[PDB]
Design an enzyme around this catalytic site. Structure first.
Site, PDB file in Angstrom:
ATOM      1  N   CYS G 166       0.087  -0.799   0.198  1.00 44.19           N
ATOM      2  CA  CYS G 166      -0.346   0.042   0.307  1.00 44.19           C
ATOM      3  C   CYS G 166       0.752   0.896   0.605  1.00 44.19           C
ATOM      4  O   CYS G 166       1.803   1.595   0.581  1.00 44.19           O
ATOM      5  CB  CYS G 166      -0.753   0.192   1.362  1.00 44.19           C
ATOM      6  SG  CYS G 166      -1.934  -0.978   1.257  1.00 44.19           S
TER       7      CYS G 166
ATOM      8  N   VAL H  46       1.827  -5.345   4.858  1.00 47.32           N
ATOM      9  CA  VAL H  46       0.950  -5.402   4.837  1.00 47.32           C
ATOM     10  C   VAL H  46      -0.067  -4.093   5.168  1.00 47.32           C
ATOM     11  O   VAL H  46       0.477  -3.353   5.864  1.00 47.32           O
ATOM     12  CB  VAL H  46       0.171  -6.515   5.070  1.00 47.32           C
ATOM     13  CG1 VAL H  46      -1.296  -6.023   5.308  1.00 47.32           C
ATOM     14  CG2 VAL H  46       0.588  -7.792   3.821  1.00 47.32           C
ATOM     15  N   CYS H  47      -1.204  -3.368   4.451  1.00 53.26           N
ATOM     16  CA  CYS H  47      -1.902  -1.910   4.849  1.00 53.26           C
ATOM     17  C   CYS H  47      -2.873  -1.701   6.259  1.00 53.26           C
ATOM     18  O   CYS H  47      -2.720  -3.367   6.737  1.00 53.26           O
ATOM     19  CB  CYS H  47      -2.604  -2.481   3.672  1.00 53.26           C
ATOM     20  SG  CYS H  47      -3.189  -0.678   2.419  1.00 53.26           S
ATOM     21  N   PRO H  48      -2.306  -0.685   6.983  1.00 47.95           N
ATOM     22  CA  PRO H  48      -2.767  -1.072   7.753  1.00 47.95           C
ATOM     23  C   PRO H  48      -3.928  -0.875   8.517  1.00 47.95           C
ATOM     24  O   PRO H  48      -4.170   0.369   9.307  1.00 47.95           O
ATOM     25  CB  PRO H  48      -1.549  -0.592   8.578  1.00 47.95           C
ATOM     26  CG  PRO H  48      -1.080   0.834   7.707  1.00 47.95           C
ATOM     27  CD  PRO H  48      -1.526  -0.178   6.355  1.00 47.95           C
ATOM     28  N   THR H  49      -4.396  -0.959   7.306  1.00 48.62           N
ATOM     29  CA  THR H  49      -6.553  -0.270   7.458  1.00 48.62           C
ATOM     30  C   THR H  49      -7.263  -1.425   8.106  1.00 48.62           C
ATOM     31  O   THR H  49      -6.324  -2.353   9.177  1.00 48.62           O
ATOM     32  CB  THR H  49      -6.933  -0.783   5.872  1.00 48.62           C
ATOM     33  OG1 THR H  49      -8.332  -0.366   6.234  1.00 48.62           O
ATOM     34  CG2 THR H  49      -6.865  -2.070   5.599  1.00 48.62           C
TER      35      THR H  49
END
Lengths: 170, 165, 165, 165, 165, 170, 166, 166, 166, 166
Positions: G166, H46-49
């Site tokens: 991302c 990996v995205c920290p969403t």
């Protein structure tokens, strides 16, 4: 389940003999009369009379073709120091086995478990490896080397000549 | 492993002494020196030379304050018969215990399991019940009673004079 | 579970037979009728009336092809002694097995574990090794040899005659 | 291990006795001499000669104070049938226990597990409940009642006379 | 659990049929419809009304191609005697099996363990050996043979005409 | 180890009866004659003749003081739907037990383990709770409700009057 | 042990799909995305809101190459009746598995032991047979089909090309 | 052996909550609605969403009386470091549980034994301690806070008004 | 049961070594002198000496043919983050092993089970795989690289010249 | 399991100290720092370099309130002879424990099972009895007493006042 009339278990210990170290095993005692002589340990104050007796009879034992093995829980290094130091042990020419593991002492079921030392037990082994005589005593109580010879001579007599001596008069 | 310097186990066996039978237990040996003398069997044609040499010195042992106990796997009935049969056994004044079960023989680990007979073993027990001298020999090899005597005297001296020389 | 009608287990015991010492095994019973006569001990005060009856009948049993084996926890040396010592026990020509281990006695489950002796029990084995008749009794209870004799004749009769009513 | 000289186990079996049906237990044997006579089955082609002998002697046994108990894996209904149906089995006045469960038979370890029937075995129990005499036999082997009678008299004699030689 | 729609276990029992004895096994029922008819015991004074009603219709069953097997814990010797004794049982032309062991009774889990007797149960087995109809009742409550007949006819129709209506 | 002549184990199932749901337990069958009627399941194509037979005899069974319990592995909800839908089940007024767990079916040892369905077994329980009669059949093979009544009447006769009927003429 | 990211155990269950019964096994989910949709039972008074949501979203799922499997402890016979009975279930095109044994319900660890019914749980299986997304809820709690669809589109994205960060 | 409807096991883990460390136990979940949010590890690419997504909703959750617990196999030290060195994780005011022992992770049967990390799971717990909703996903497959929030509203609705009909 | 003189157990852990990740196994310790350096966790406030001390010596170790392996229960992601966000850990060019499973930690019996972290231990391994020297310490008690380096020189000396006398 | 940070098991061993024999137990190490110094055996040809280093550093250790315990499988009788024999051992002031049973050697897990001797291992015990520093080496490898002293001074520092960071 006594050890009398049984084969000795194998072992691999270090020992001291005549100013040099050697490795004694169960193969070294094959085809010869052997006498395992257990005792507490080196450098104790109690008189070494028992070791001094058998030292004198060692020459006589060698004539009968009998090996002698002094066995203790102490190391083979400590035996060399005790031989160079003490007065009576200077007389010892036969092998002094060191048993730091206790394996050899455990094979003859002769261990002071709580003390970590060996009991005073004299064993007599024949050429085949069978134990023919046992003599165990406590601290202080002596054991005669002349009586040991009597048993060895009696053992050699029976070994060569089975079925001896009296029946009884009624 | 290593029966020496251990208190003897309890038992309850019938024995023979001077024409009559008697029951012996572990409570008999308390407060007295006792010597358990094991041998294979009665009426064996290998003669009693080590046994009978113990019949001698018996005055010396009893004077000194020591009990003698002949032990075997055979019954006390056979012990009585063997006393009357042989002359050397007729000298026996002390108790002769029978171990048809083998219980007392098993306590000292002195049993020929495959043969069902006791080994030639001599044990020296003190008043407390602790063992201080063991002597086991093979068949044919005798046991010296004069040597046994010295072991008793040495044991009594160490008991009365502990922690010396 | 039941002991009657089963193959007897192997063994190797010493025995005494009219002067000689011999080794008897399960192989000696093969192809023969055998009678194992257990009894407590030798040199007892109890009358050897049971063994005396079998001694008399033994002549007759040997003609039929029936072996007899006296068994006890006492040694084979004591068996030679008790035979030569006294009494009507001198009559016996059949083998007297010594079972110091108790192995032969424990194969028939016939031991007093407290006393270390054998119970009074008579057994009858066929050529195949199968037990046919059993007779166990207590101390003082007599066993009749003539009664035993009839059961052996009946056993051989049924063996040769499968279908009988 | 040995069955002779031990306390008989409890039970609750149905039984047939001269017309009546009754429940017999181990409590009925208490303070009495009892004789448990096992046999394979009813209505067999084999001669009831063994049961016929006991029927004759029963008069004498009841005077001594001895009860008799015929046992089999067949039911108590079949026992009434076999009695009333035929033969010398009508002689018997003593109880005939039915053991369809086999519990009473398994207490004496006396069952043919393959056939599901009881082996030929006679037992003798005392007032205390201890077994004194046992006599197990195979198919076709006869059992003598007069021989049994002597063993019962001897059993009562030894019970009243502890010290006999 | 749920014995229905399972292949019957193997067995080997002796039986009685028309004055003689015969051995029956699981290999006899293969390729034929069989009906195992369990009942408690022989010579029970509760009369055979359900049994005997099965003796009737036997022509109808054998014509249809069905075997009948009366089963009980009693022996085949008692089965033979009960046939001659009662008149209602004298009509029986089919086999009457005995289970002194109880093995065949245990296969259908139809044993009164505490009583040692079989329960009143009727099983319908097909040529393959699969069970397709079970009927167990308590003592006193009868079993209708005309109802049994309809169960057989219904079973044969479903077998010949599978997966219909 | 047959279930004949043994006490029924306890249970707690939901059922449908006359346009409303109810919870039947082992306490509800205390002191009354009960008939557990097992069967595969709802909405099968095979004709519901066996349920229709006992439905007609239910009035006659209620006069004798006998309860009827139809038991299946299906839910109590599905029984209500099948009652409102089908033609023959409309006649059913007695309780229709739903056994989604199978516990009640397992208590009578009557489970088609590999199918997850119940076998066709009719049980007859008395006021004490002892099973007096069992009748198990396979798929297709019918079971008569008139014969069931004969067993129930015979069971009630023996219950009130033990030791009945013939001995045999020799 | 967690059940996510594991291969499904094999099975043999009968089912109902558009006026016809058909047998379904683990062979049918090979090489295709599958959605095992568990629920308590048929003919309950609880409004079938969740099954109605999956019914109208079934067109999208078939476009994405995704099969739907309605699973319950009730039989396939009852499913057919419940399809004809109610309106919201009449619009079900996908298969309805009958699981009277429970075998399928036990394979996913999703059985109400006390009740003997299947918990309301949704799974997302991939062509390989690996379970990617799991969703279990309590009785009364709703399950969003649009959110289920979002997970499927996200699952297919990662399966086609992983990582990317991302 | 499905833990949909069961009381959570006890624990005593250290956690990082808003510029400081705190110890939290099952005693803190004696009242209130606790939500345990599991994830693999910190400082991953990996995205920290999800975590950042819930941070926005957290203010709304706090009004409803709902706690959020971010759980991972990493230490509480790494959480503070990751929070200080973040961009969208900086919004997290709720507690971040460190589980080096993996005791709290294994309590929910949510451990990747071969990897030694936690799976991407979300658990919703009621005041009594009973679990109501579950949501497990594979790597890459996200889970939105709006769907989670809706489940919480539905959970509080069923708890407050039990037994509804249709 | 003292593991002073024994061959190291096999493993397959991920590690961070100088701006990139690598997988390392017991196969890499088939020749060479490997040195496993255990410590509690990353981003702790406790001094990052020892690690920074060995970083200076590392050039000297590399000449002797000696590998250094920093081991911890934290992930390989956290090592890169801690290395990037450090002051004296930035000197570490040698590998930093992540052990989330704790398999490599338990191989040397060096795990704090209650805490789920590794103890402060240093192990010296020879080319054969046999362990020669051990050094474990409590929190706060440091261990200098000079003493460690001397032990390695002594270890290579005894290996090259076995059997000496005095 | 790691032995560091654990309480010592009790014992009863005879010992030798300056021409006199004395019995030592776990009672004697209460409320004082203790250093259990293990070694293979007496009268070996290996030069006693390590015991000589601890001998001359004994003055510092006594000032810090630290006891030293030379432990070996050899008896206390042999220690007295070895004290009179060699020069380097003649300068030993601290106690020499005889451990023929091995009990003490087994309590610290430090026995050469095959040889029946004690491995050369140094321990650092605190007043409470908790082991703080452990050092084990192979035969031939030296042990630095000055580095041992450094660990003791570092151990006492942390024991007096923990934390403080860097």
């Amino acid at each position: 389940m006594s050890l009398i009339n049984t084969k000795i278990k194998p072992f691999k210990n270090q020992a001291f003999k005549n100013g040099e170290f050697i490795e004694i095993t169960e193969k070294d005692t094959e085809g010869r009369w052997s006498v395992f002589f257990f005792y507490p340990a080196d450098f104790t104050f109690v008189c070494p009379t028992e070791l001094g007796d058998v030292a004198d009879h060692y020459e006589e034992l060698q004539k009968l073709g009998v090996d002698v093995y002094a066995v203790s829980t102490d190391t083979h290094f400590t035996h060399k120091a005790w031989h160079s130091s003490s007065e009576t042990i200077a007389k010892i020419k036969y092998a002094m086995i060191g048993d730091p593991t206790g394996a050899l002492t455990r094979n003859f079921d002769n261990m002071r478990e709580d003390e970590g030392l060996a009991d005073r037990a004299t064993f007599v082994v024949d050429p085949q490896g069978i134990i023919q005589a046992i003599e165990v005593t406590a601290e202080g109580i002596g054991r005669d080397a002349s009586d040991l010879l009597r048993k060895i001579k009696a053992a050699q007599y029976v070994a060569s000549h089975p079925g001896e001596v009296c029946p009884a008069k009624w």
